[PDB]
Each structure stands twice: as structure tokens, then as C-alpha cells.
Amino acid sequence: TCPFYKKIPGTGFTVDAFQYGVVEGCTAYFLTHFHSDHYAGLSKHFTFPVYCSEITGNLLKNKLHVQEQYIHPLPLDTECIVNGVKVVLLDANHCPGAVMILFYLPNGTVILHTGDFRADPSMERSLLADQKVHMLYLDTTYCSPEYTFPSQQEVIRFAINTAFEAVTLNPHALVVCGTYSIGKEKVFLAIADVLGSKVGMSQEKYKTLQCLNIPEINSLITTDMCSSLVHLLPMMQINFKGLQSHLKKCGGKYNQILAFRPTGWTHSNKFTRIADVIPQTKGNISIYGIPYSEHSSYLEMKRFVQWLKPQKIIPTVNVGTWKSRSTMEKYFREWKLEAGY
């Protein structure tokens, strides 16, 4: 049964609710982004209207084979009417195709559903500037002050400089980057650009990337692993055994691996600056964990909410424990008392 924080009151709508069967009263199913915890249940046999971005709709049609007649892509930053209700899709600064959804209820209430997002001050000049929001369904993944991490730009600067130094010292080094979902494509694209290489990958991953509307993508990626010195591998293979095995397969072309695991936050974030990050090394294999986040830090979250001034907050992450729920509610009240709404 579909939980309450996935339902939009006063409409026939649900958000990211495909794993509950036929939801009673739902006339339109919205999908914020193509991550498995959110699309769980979709397939070629789904026969209700799905509303989403263009990019998410390319992924539904090519990767899950959802039939075309049930895919309803909407343009961003544009007022659309869906089953008699005005909606707007906004860029969520999460993975490719990820959106936040503004719903203008027939009674005058305005609801923002963030989906998954990384809050940014540029959102303060979107269509959100123009009216009041009563209810916020909030991505609270990192809603605690211990969750600090650097900007995406500092993280990519670290990765480019690290990879360029290593391969210029040793032209026979291979760079490997882990992946298990869409998102974080700047990590492997930025490194391949500094090295003058395409990114090599499996046919299944190439297929996925081809759905993303990235400009000039045919110039940046390939399935011919032999021509490339940046390879993508499943995240599970980014360990010493997995990487040793991969280096065997490359036929003596390479004699060293430098690998990257883009994680979210890890508790090495409470002590170390990005500048000071060091790898784990065994022999001719080095593995860097880099804190590339596609979710808000605590401070980015707090700034957004204090700017938006919602009347009510509904968390969508960390909702399963009483300790989590109580912690999040305390911070919401602090924020509201400090800013005065």
C-alpha cells in the first residue's frame, strides 16, 4: 500500500509510486527521475499515464520498454494542464532528467515536491520566485549538520588534476571510474576530456548514456575499450580483486590503474579537506573515494527552506525511524524560529 508522503491531496496524482500495484484513485503517475528506488515497478506491461521529463521518458521507452502511448513527457519551466490541474516541472540539480514538480491545486494551495535534489541559490530565480508555497515534500537525505561535503566544481578540479598528473608521469596508466546508475557523468567526462580520450564502456551503459541529451556525446564515449584510456566499470568491481582482473584483460597495454569511486558522504568528510584526500593502494592499483554529491548538504537544504518559507514540510527520506523523524522535526523548527516565518 502506497504511503501518504507519495500522494498529492486534492488530485488524482501520485509521485514515485509504481511498486504498490493499481493505487486507488490515481489517474496520473508522476516520475521525478530514473533511479531504481523511484521507478521500482515500471515495465512494458504498465498501462497508466506516466508524466515525466523528456530525458526520463527516453529511458522508460529504451531501458524499461514502457510503451510510447503511456509516456507523457513535459517540457521544463512551462505551465502545463494535467487532468485539469496546472503543473510545472523544474530542474532538480540531481541526475540527468531529474525534476521537482509544482502543483497548483484547485482550492488555491500550492505544493512543491522536490523529488531528489541538490539545492542551489539559482533555484531562488526560477518560477518559484513568483508565488507562495504552502506544502514542501522535501528530499531530506542529508538533513543533519554533520553532513558537509565540497562543491561539485572543487571535486571535479581534484579529479582532473589527480588523473592528469598520474597519466603524464606514466603514459601506461589506465583510469577506471565506477558507476551503478545514471548521475555523476561529469566525473568520467571531465577526466577523459583532460586526457584526450573517449570513455570506454559496456554496450548496456552506452545505451543508457545515449538517452540523456548530452551535447556532442558521440564525440565523448565509445564501446571500443581498446581505443580508450578511461574505462567505466560497475561500482561493485571497484576493489583490488576486480581491478586486478580487469588489468589482465587489457593484454599488457597498461601496467597501473588509478580508479575513482564517486560516493555520497562518508565520515572521512568530518575530518579531511578535499585537498588532503589520499587513496587506498595495493601494488600498482590506487583507489580514490571522492565525495561527489547529487543531494543537498545540510547548509544548502537549510538555505533553500529558509528562503522558500513553507507552511508545512513533509520529508520523503529517512522516514522509517522515530529517531530520524524527531531529529528532522527539530531542525525544521529551529529553521523557522531563526528566520521568523
Binding site for Ni ion (CB under 5 A): 35, 116
Smallest distance, Å, CB 166 to Ni ion?
A: 31
Contact present, 298 and 144 (Cβ < 8 Å): yes
Please state, in angstroms and rounded to a whole number, the distance separating the CA atoms of residues 300 and 265: 14
Q: Which helix (H) or strand (E) holds 60?
A: helix 54-62
Could you tell me which residues come within 8 angstroms of residue 323 by beta carbon, excluding any fewer than 6 positions away? none
Strand partners of residue 87: 80, 103
Contact present, 324 and 141 (Cβ < 8 Å): no
Task: Name residue 136's amino acid.
Answer: L
Could you tell me which residues come within 8 angstroms of residue 209 by beta carbon, excluding any fewer than 6 positions away? 185, 201, 217, 221
Nearer to Ni ion, 116 or 185 (CB): 116
Nearer to Ni ion, 32 or 228 (CB): 32
Q: How many helices (H) and strands (E) does the chain have?
A: 8, 18
Could you tell me which residues come within 8 angstroms of residue 182 by beta carbon, excluding any fewer than 6 positions away? 34, 35, 59, 95, 96, 97, 208, 212
Contact present, 292 and 262 (Cβ < 8 Å): yes
Q: Within 10 A of 198 (CB to CB), how many other CB atoms are there?
A: 19
The three three-digit cell numbers of residue 298, written as one number: 545540510
